[PDB]
Amino acid sequence: STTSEQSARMTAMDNASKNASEMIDKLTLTFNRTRQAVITKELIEIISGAA
Amino acid sequence: TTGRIVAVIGAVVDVQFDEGLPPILNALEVQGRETRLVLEVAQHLGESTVRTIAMDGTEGLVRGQKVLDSGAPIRIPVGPETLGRIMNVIGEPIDERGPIKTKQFAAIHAEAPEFVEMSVEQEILVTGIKVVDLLAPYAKGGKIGLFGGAGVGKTVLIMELINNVAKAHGGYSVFAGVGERTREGNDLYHEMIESGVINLKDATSKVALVYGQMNEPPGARARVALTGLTVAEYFRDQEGQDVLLFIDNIFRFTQAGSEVSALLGRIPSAVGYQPTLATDMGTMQERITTTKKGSITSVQAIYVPADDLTDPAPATTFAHLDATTVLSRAIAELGIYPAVDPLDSTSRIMDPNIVGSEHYDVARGVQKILQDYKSLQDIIAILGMDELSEEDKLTVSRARKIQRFLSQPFQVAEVFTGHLGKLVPLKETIKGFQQILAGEYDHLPEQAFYMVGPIEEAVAKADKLA
Amino acid sequence: TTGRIVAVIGAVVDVQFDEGLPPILNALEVQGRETRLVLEVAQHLGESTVRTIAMDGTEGLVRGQKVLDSGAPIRIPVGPETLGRIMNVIGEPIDERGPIKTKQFAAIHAEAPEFVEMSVEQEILVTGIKVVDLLAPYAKGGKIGLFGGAGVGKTVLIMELINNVAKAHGGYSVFAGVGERTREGNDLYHEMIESGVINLKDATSKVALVYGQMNEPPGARARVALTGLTVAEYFRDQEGQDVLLFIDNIFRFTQAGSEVSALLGRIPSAVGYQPTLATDMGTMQERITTTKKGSITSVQAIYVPADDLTDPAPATTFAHLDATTVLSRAIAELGIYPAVDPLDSTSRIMDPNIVGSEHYDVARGVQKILQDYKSLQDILSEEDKLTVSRARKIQRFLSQPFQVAEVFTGHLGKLVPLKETIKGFQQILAGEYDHLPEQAFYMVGPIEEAVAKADKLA
Amino acid sequence: DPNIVGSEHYDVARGVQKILQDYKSLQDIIAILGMDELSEEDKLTVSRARKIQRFLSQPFQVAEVFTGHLGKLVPLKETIKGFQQILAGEYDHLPEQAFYMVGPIEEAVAKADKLAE
Amino acid sequence: VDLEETGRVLSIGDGIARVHGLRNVQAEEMVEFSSGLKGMSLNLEPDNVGVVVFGNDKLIKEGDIVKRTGAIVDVPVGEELLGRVVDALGNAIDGKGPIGSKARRRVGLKAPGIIPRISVREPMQTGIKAVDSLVPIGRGQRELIIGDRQTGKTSIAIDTIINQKRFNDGTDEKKKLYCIYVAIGQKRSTVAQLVKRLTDADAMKYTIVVSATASDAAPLQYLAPYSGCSMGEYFRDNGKHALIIYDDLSKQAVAYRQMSLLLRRPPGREAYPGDVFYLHSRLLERAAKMNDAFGGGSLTALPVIETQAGDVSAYIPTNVISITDGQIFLETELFYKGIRPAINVGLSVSRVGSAAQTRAMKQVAGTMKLELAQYREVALDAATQQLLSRGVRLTELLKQGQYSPMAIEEQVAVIYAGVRGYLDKLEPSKITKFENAFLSHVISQHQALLGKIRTDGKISEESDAKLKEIVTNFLAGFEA
Amino acid sequence: YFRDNGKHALIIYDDLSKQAVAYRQMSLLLRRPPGREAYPGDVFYLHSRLLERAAKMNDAFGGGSLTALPVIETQAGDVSAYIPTNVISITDGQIFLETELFYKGIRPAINVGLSVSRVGSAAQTRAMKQVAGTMKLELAQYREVAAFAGSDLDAATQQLLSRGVRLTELLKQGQYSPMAIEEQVAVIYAGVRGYLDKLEPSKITKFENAFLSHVISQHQALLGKIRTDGKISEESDAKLKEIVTNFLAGFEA
Amino acid sequence: YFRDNGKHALIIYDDLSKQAVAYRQMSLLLRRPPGREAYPGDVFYLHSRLLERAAKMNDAFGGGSLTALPVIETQAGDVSAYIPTNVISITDGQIFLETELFYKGIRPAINVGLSVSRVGSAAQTRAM
Numbered sequence A: 001s002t003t004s005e006q007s008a009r010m011t012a013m014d015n016a017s018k019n020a021s022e023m024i025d026k027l028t029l030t031f032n033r034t035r036q037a038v039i040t041k042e043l044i045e046i047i048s049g050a051a
Numbered sequence B: 001t002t003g004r005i006v007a008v009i010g011a012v013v014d015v016q017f018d019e020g021l022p023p024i025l026n027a028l029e030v031q032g033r034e035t036r037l038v039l040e041v042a043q044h045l046g047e048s049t050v051r052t053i054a055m056d057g058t059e060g061l062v063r064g065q066k067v068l069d070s071g072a073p074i075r076i077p078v079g080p081e082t083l084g085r086i087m088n089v090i091g092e093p094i095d096e097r098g099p100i101k102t103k104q105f106a107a108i109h110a111e112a113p114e115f116v117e118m119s120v121e122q123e124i125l126v127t128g129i130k131v132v133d134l135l136a137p138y139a140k141g142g143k144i145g146l147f148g149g150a151g152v153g154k155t156v157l158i159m160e161l162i163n164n165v166a167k168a169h170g171g172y173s174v175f176a177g178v179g180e181r182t183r184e185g186n187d188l189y190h191e192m193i194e195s196g197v198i199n200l201k202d203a204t205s206k207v208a209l210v211y212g213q214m215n216e217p218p219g220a221r222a223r224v225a226l227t228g229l230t231v232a233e234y235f236r237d238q239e240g241q242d243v244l245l246f247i248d249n250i251f252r253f254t255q256a257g258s259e260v261s262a263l264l265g266r267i268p269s270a271v272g273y274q275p276t277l278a279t280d281m282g283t284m285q286e287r288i289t290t291t292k293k294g295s296i297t298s299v300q301a302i303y304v305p306a307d308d309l310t311d312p313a314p315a316t317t318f319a320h321l322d323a324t325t326v327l328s329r330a331i332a333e334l335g336i337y338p339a340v341d342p343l344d345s346t347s348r349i350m351d352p353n354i355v356g357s358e359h360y361d362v363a364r365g366v367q368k369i370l371q372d373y374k375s376l377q378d379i380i381a382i383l384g385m386d387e388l389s390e391e392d393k394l395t396v397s398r399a400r401k402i403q404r405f406l407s408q409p410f411q412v413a414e415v416f417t418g419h420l421g422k423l424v425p426l427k428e429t430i431k432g433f434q435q436i437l438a439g440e441y442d443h444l445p446e447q448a449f450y451m452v453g454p455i456e457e458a459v460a461k462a463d464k465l466a
Numbered sequence C: 001t002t003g004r005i006v007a008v009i010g011a012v013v014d015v016q017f018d019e020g021l022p023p024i025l026n027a028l029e030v031q032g033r034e035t036r037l038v039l040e041v042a043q044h045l046g047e048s049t050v051r052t053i054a055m056d057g058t059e060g061l062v063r064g065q066k067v068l069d070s071g072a073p074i075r076i077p078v079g080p081e082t083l084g085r086i087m088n089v090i091g092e093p094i095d096e097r098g099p100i101k102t103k104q105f106a107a108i109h110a111e112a113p114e115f116v117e118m119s120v121e122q123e124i125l126v127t128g129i130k131v132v133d134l135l136a137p138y139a140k141g142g143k144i145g146l147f148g149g150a151g152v153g154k155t156v157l158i159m160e161l162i163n164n165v166a167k168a169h170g171g172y173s174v175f176a177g178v179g180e181r182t183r184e185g186n187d188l189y190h191e192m193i194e195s196g197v198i199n200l201k202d203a204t205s206k207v208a209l210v211y212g213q214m215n216e217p218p219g220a221r222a223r224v225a226l227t228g229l230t231v232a233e234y235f236r237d238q239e240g241q242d243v244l245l246f247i248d249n250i251f252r253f254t255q256a257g258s259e260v261s262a263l264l265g266r267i268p269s270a271v272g273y274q275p276t277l278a279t280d281m282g283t284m285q286e287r288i289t290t291t292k293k294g295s296i297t298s299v300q301a302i303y304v305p306a307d308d309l310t311d312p313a314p315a316t317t318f319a320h321l322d323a324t325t326v327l328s329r330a331i332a333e334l335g336i337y338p339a340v341d342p343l344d345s346t347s348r349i350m351d352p353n354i355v356g357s358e359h360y361d362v363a364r365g366v367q368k369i370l371q372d373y374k375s376l377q378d379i380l381s382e383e384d385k386l387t388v389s390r391a392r393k394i395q396r397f398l399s400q401p402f403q404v405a406e407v408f409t410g411h412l413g414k415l416v417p418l419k420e421t422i423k424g425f426q427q428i429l430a431g432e433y434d435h436l437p438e439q440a441f442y443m444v445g446p447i448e449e450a451v452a453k454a455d456k457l458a
Numbered sequence D: 001d002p003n004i005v006g007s008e009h010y011d012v013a014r015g016v017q018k019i020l021q022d023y024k025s026l027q028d029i030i031a032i033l034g035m036d037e038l039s040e041e042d043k044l045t046v047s048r049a050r051k052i053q054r055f056l057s058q059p060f061q062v063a064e065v066f067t068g069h070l071g072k073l074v075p076l077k078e079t080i081k082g083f084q085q086i087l088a089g090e091y092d093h094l095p096e097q098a099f100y101m102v103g104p105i106e107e108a109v110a111k112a113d114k115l116a117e
Numbered sequence E: 001v002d003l004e005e006t007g008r009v010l011s012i013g014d015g016i017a018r019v020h021g022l023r024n025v026q027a028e029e030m031v032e033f034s035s036g037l038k039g040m041s042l043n044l045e046p047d048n049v050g051v052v053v054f055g056n057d058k059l060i061k062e063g064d065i066v067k068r069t070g071a072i073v074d075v076p077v078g079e080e081l082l083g084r085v086v087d088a089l090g091n092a093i094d095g096k097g098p099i100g101s102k103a104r105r106r107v108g109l110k111a112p113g114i115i116p117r118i119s120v121r122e123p124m125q126t127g128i129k130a131v132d133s134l135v136p137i138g139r140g141q142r143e144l145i146i147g148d149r150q151t152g153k154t155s156i157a158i159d160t161i162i163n164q165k166r167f168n169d170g171t172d173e174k175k176k177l178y179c180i181y182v183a184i185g186q187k188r189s190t191v192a193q194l195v196k197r198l199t200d201a202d203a204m205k206y207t208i209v210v211s212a213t214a215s216d217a218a219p220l221q222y223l224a225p226y227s228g229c230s231m232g233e234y235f236r237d238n239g240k241h242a243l244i245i246y247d248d249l250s251k252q253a254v255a256y257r258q259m260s261l262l263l264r265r266p267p268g269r270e271a272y273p274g275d276v277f278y279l280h281s282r283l284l285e286r287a288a289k290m291n292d293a294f295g296g297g298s299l300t301a302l303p304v305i306e307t308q309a310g311d312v313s314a315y316i317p318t319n320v321i322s323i324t325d326g327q328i329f330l331e332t333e334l335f336y337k338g339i340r341p342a343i344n345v346g347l348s349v350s351r352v353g354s355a356a357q358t359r360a361m362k363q364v365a366g367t368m369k370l371e372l373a374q375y376r377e378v379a380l381d382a383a384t385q386q387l388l389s390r391g392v393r394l395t396e397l398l399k400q401g402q403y404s405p406m407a408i409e410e411q412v413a414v415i416y417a418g419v420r421g422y423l424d425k426l427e428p429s430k431i432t433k434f435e436n437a438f439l440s441h442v443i444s445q446h447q448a449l450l451g452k453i454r455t456d457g458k459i460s461e462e463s464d465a466k467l468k469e470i471v472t473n474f475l476a477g478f479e480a
Numbered sequence F: 001y002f003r004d005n006g007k008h009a010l011i012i013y014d015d016l017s018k019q020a021v022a023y024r025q026m027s028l029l030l031r032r033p034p035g036r037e038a039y040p041g042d043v044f045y046l047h048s049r050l051l052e053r054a055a056k057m058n059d060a061f062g063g064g065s066l067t068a069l070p071v072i073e074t075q076a077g078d079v080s081a082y083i084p085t086n087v088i089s090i091t092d093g094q095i096f097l098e099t100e101l102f103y104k105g106i107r108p109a110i111n112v113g114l115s116v117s118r119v120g121s122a123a124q125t126r127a128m129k130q131v132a133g134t135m136k137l138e139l140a141q142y143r144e145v146a147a148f149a150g151s152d153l154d155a156a157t158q159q160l161l162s163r164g165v166r167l168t169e170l171l172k173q174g175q176y177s178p179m180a181i182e183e184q185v186a187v188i189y190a191g192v193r194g195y196l197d198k199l200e201p202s203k204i205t206k207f208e209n210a211f212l213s214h215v216i217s218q219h220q221a222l223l224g225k226i227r228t229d230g231k232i233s234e235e236s237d238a239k240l241k242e243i244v245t246n247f248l249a250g251f252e253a
Numbered sequence G: 001y002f003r004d005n006g007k008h009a010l011i012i013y014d015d016l017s018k019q020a021v022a023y024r025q026m027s028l029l030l031r032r033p034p035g036r037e038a039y040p041g042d043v044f045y046l047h048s049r050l051l052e053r054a055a056k057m058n059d060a061f062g063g064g065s066l067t068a069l070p071v072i073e074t075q076a077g078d079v080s081a082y083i084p085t086n087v088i089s090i091t092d093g094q095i096f097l098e099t100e101l102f103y104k105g106i107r108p109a110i111n112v113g114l115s116v117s118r119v120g121s122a123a124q125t126r127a128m
């Protein structure tokens, strides 16, 4: 049982480590969009304040 | 008496008068144009020069071209002989059926009804739609808003709400196409001719149409909401008869206001918007209301820029509403229609004192389990549903069945689905969800609850899969 | 005519003219200065006054100082005499070897060839390198994006490309240093002497260098790529050659264009970049092309800011690239040279109608086996034992000893023809060399050398 | 700096900081897998780090309405010694809430008796 | 000397030229510069005229004479443009000579209103299996092609133009479709290769190409879709049918954003102007289906939007989605896996195009649509495994090569085999091989039935049992 | 006026978010340059000078007061925004409300962790201080273990989770039924003293309704004594204990 | 001076972040066009002029050298900030410091993986 339990856990956490990595990848793309969005927003607030 | 064009850019046109200057909001007539070009005075710039905004294309205008003051603001046809007709911003007929000979005219600008004119009546309007009636029901004479991003189903929802309510409402209805698709106006017009709610042969017509779509310059789109509003206003006051006002889409009002604001020499607000955003919307929205004199049940489709509900345009709109229906892209992409977010749709009448103690408790029960399911979403995606406890697995299965039972086949979406349109009574909607919450259909499969009418059809669908 | 300075703000110089105004993009010569200061006309402000960007420092300038109109945009030296020499943006030599005694001159601001001048034929530029020719081939009159960090073999690959193209085809190369470190500009110059692509004692130099260092004003770094482009344009238009243009680095070209825009008071677009971002790129990139006379093919070093590929700087660039050469550090650590990632590197001209009808299937089979090898690296079964071995024997055959790499390793460099490259990888896939060990393919030219290496250590 | 506050003072300060920084990385484990997964060495440092967290806290004499009980001043030499004792594991037998909102280390011992009965 | 019909340049640099005089000039009127360049009167001001320059503004100096043309910005239209490659102004850039154009149309003409329009009913065949079955396009419709770079966006458009030859050669004038391809921001090489592909496939003879490349000035790129639309509007109002493709509208917005920011207009999301939605909306609204009283012509639009990282919630994508009548969505993940075309059937919608689909195609695609819809919630007992078995098999049928757009009756044959359960016992990896062998069989042996379905547009009792014997007998023969 | 005439008044600004929007419009159209989120430079001083006018006067000035309850609306919970960050730094405390808690059944949707009051127990009756004094930390110990827990927890940490869950259920309250302070103390008493620790969490709300109405109809003398005395008497503590323990066992069956 | 007269000099700019802040104040108040983070479009030109002046001269020019150790202060490790961005690309290499390493006990708090010197090896002695 314990030989079966351990090897099945090996795959279970391997699949979970794949799911979490796919999740990071999707959030990283969101981070980059938000990072670009903040830069532009700060920049407009300066241009407008000058003009 | 006579004016002269001195500056032209986009919809913003400057006119200089030698003697007698036109007051703000006055309609001006441009001479030398083959079709009528109305300039609406917005600002007095000084030195006898006014800043105006057009209602049609300003191409073919010359510096020195003559402009005449009409003496009044833009005036449109109002009354019973507008029913069954289509008109533009300045009240000109666009159905090729001739002149709209009305006994009364009214200016598109008017002051909003005073505080003493307000009515406090709150009475449920059963839409026949599950997500709406259960969680955030609409009110008679109340203000309804339909939020959503690009393609989630704002138009499809407002068209189903026309079909469900307007038939059972023995009164007049007004549709205002604002900055939307012109072919949608063609579809609505000929469908109404087909059904008989608009008649060309007879005066039995019940709906008045006003259109200024996304092919029009910002001046037209910015004002067209008032033109359809003024038609609706007349029917409320000088008759007493109840009115339905449908607007698609009200965002185009504020968007067009942003386009002209850039040319009026304003300092921009946040997100590049107009500094007068909230007050422009305020003086416009407060005209759409029920009074002691008459009742207006308004439904407004509200676009959401880049799906951002914190955008100044949709964000400011919330306070002008009595019931909200927010549509989500993620809920749409799961196959749920209508794509109503159960945890972002609200109603002022969702209250045990108004809708009943059983109605309220079930509504809050449905919401509790969906928020509990939303909290587990992360662990479900990492590990799996099989790694959950016996308590959590039970809520997940029930919540997933509740999600699907919230969806509904629409009569307007009889082609998009190929299925039959379903209209579900309130008592049967409450009963349906109540049984799933108490654990009466735990044995039944998920897909049985997907796209059904009442609870009985969920059982009958499960029999075929046995 | 003569002009007078009326305003000096940083690298922006305003000049008034009494009689005639110099059109935009004209080069202005400032009088009464020790070193030649050029001003490029950018705007006509009105009242007979023009706005210019400075190509060098503006310190010591007085209001009313004389300025001469050249009557033309910046004119640089062109010809065979440019080969082996380093010039700045304006055309002065910066290698201290005397004047660039050229026969012709050409203006750096030239329009892209017309639609009718375009060559419809799609051809493969044979590099001789095996990883490229098979999987991610370079197109004649195309753009190639060179990906990779620091110390993976970018300069060695560049020096070999200069060597290989001029060796087999006879086409000269041009290097444009856009906003590069002066120290690494110095190091690159001598490494090219050591490799042989630049010779100082005869006229066999294969590269003409164009430098625009980091310590220079935005204007100079902005136009430096156009200067190298003009150097390359001569060999194609006048002498009909398939020329290489090396741009390092393409992001720094974009960076300097943003700075010019910001200096001129222009409201910045998204992420702080210039509003003319796509048009600054377009008017530059469209000069790199195949015409009736010949072709200009460019290898462009890529930097991806914040490791974000959707950034406007790389995003605008990507729409111009025809191929990618992705270098990897992990493959460099495995000892494989060149350190090319055989899956990351892609090319648009991988089509059975452009390249031979024998080319496409072979390269797809190589791609299939390498993907299958990486997918099954998690874990003994029969079908795997044959495919795992074959894929490892393909990776090692993808490696190649470079002629430039004699200072690193003692092995002799090789130029492998396209026909010999195709048949080689085809034979490993079919199973002809299943009886050979893995190390037989590591660092060899053609597949006849893979046979000979297996005999020696047997 | 060891050449200013003393080598004894400095090493306790860094020692307290070290176990709290190491506890932060251990907090990342017990957030997902739980307390049962930690080694006997791990839960020894956790219990010590949690006791050090609380011993850093003290009742102020201007905050009578917030914490309930009066405030008190703690001498420097007693402060170094107090944390020094916990780092050595001299109070691994005392409960966790005994170190919460007290003065010197002597008050933590007296509070430990008061939690029993 | 004549500051009424003439003018002179005051200043030039920030995208727009300031011009003294031109007192009698109209708003949105084309002007004429000394150097040979044209421009548009945008800002009519008390003291000057702001002019948008259609070209390289290096050729314009202070003091240069500017003349009125007297006409609102227009472009040449008509059938003379077919087979020609023009720039944004309608000037021939293929060296084949002047275009003998008679009529001219304004580029900024307002879209037809409610009354002149009617519901779409005529099919617009792409030749692609996945499109003509699951996302059917009608004539007069707007259908957005959306996705990341190199997902296959342009490929959809080109295969559609190539497909039309089968109609444009036949003796049926109503079923013909004249194509227009607008190139915005693309490389000049990509367009030069594109014209050759159409030339060799004999598709160019009914195609007009409007090109404003990456080296062309931003105003020219801004104008290019409006000039192309006017050329398509000629067919629309004259009882003929035209297809327009904007490749791409994403780069037009970048070109307009440049203009707007140089004009110092207040930016919003992604530094875009507030009228950027209006920039696309007025253009795509001009694509319409006209009723009998207006000749019965139509203009079908296929705008292209390049997304970043597969994001469809972005500002420009959300605009055009809320303009068009549905979207064909492509995904990089699908392309890498072998799904080519990389169409996401789940997220792809055709709003009004469902009515414009042949009776035969509706008889097979309807049940394929449902079975694919059934397949998506599970992607294992005999109930769900069968849906998973049917799913992957039908998916292989949606896979298609380039440059061979199929006829409707050929498409209706291959979907028939999948839907009626002839693939069920065959393994998923070899379905393509079966599809090719089956198709080459029916074209070689049964031209009587393929010509029967196409003419009727329908599969009746006569053809259904006729097609039953054909597939069943072939499947017994097919043994690999 | 009330404040300066020996009287106590309560003002509610609903909301200062929309006031700032209105002031921005004015300032922008007066051609005053925009700053963060287009707001003018003095938008902080707008609200500061307003809320400073709320005060408690000394006896020589009348002993009157003015209490202020400003309202601020956030966007998607963004407490970092220009306007909200100003008003948080002005006020003597904040009551944080969240949609997540609202739909979880926690109504009112008060985030206890984020919400504070600088005046504290000095603004409470002697009765409420006795029961709520422990609640703060007891709930803080709970939230620590909440995002710390099905790997099975020990008896001590499961107890902290149980107590916290049961106190949270007591903080739930419907609308338009504001409770007197003596009725509040009584229901808090039962939870804080552990008399509900072994009760199923779903019936705590049900418990409170029936328990309170029994104390209202049959034990007015107890509530009346807590109201008038202002604290929990030793006799009142004994009586409260007598009712809750016997009610417990009846309800449990 | 040392670099040109054969001698070897080392310079530490502590720090360049604040120098850029001083120059931003000057530029903004002169009404020079503001860019990202309010910095003018010549702030790169500012740092590149200074740091490029650090060099190793050949024996023909005396064989002197000037080594530069400029300092940049990041905010929450943001290397993508405008001033950190400019200086990273200008400099030959970076020595990275982190708060977590410092309080773990690893002080000096240098990330071996993140820190880089692409010259590096050519400087080291045979023993090293």
Ligand SMILES: Nc1ncnc2c1ncn2[C@@H]1O[C@H](COP(=O)(O)OP(=O)(O)O)[C@@H](O)[C@H]1O
Pocket: B148, B149, B150, B151, B152, B153, B154, B155, B156, B157, B337, B338, B339, B410, B413, B416, B417, E321, E322, E349, E350, E351
């Ligand atoms: N209730 C629904 N049932 C079926 N399909 C729907 C529904 N709502 C929306 N859709 C799908 O979404 C598409 C866009 O709907 P629409 O109302 O036009 O979006 P919006 O008006 O918000 O842009 C429709 O073509 C339809 O296919």
Ligand SMILES: Nc1ncnc2c1ncn2[C@@H]1O[C@H](COP(=O)(O)OP(=O)(O)O)[C@@H](O)[C@H]1O
Pocket: C149, C150, C151, C152, C153, C154, C155, C156, C157, C337, C338, C402, C405, C408, C409
């Ligand atoms: N083709 C190659 N063959 C052998 N070694 C190589 C090759 N390319 C690079 N290297 C090794 O990598 C190191 C750095 O190479 P270089 O081209 O200078 O990279 P970079 O230009 O990115 O610094 C060299 O010291 C060399 O040993």
Ligand SMILES: Nc1ncnc2c1ncn2[C@@H]1O[C@H](COP(=O)(O)OP(=O)(O)O)[C@@H](O)[C@H]1O
Pocket: C348, E147, E148, E149, E150, E151, E152, E153, E154, E155, E156, E340, E341, E400, E401, E402
């Ligand atoms: N159905 C297909 N089968 C095989 N290759 C395809 C297919 N569609 C596109 N491609 C290839 O993919 C590449 C990118 O296609 P393209 O249409 O240019 O995408 P995009 O328009 O998004 O850039 C082209 O080189 C083309 O040959």
Ligand SMILES: [Mg+2]
Pocket: B154, B155, B156, B180
């Ligand atoms: Mg809509």
Ligand SMILES: [Mg+2]
Pocket: E153, E154, E155, E247
């Ligand atoms: Mg494309």
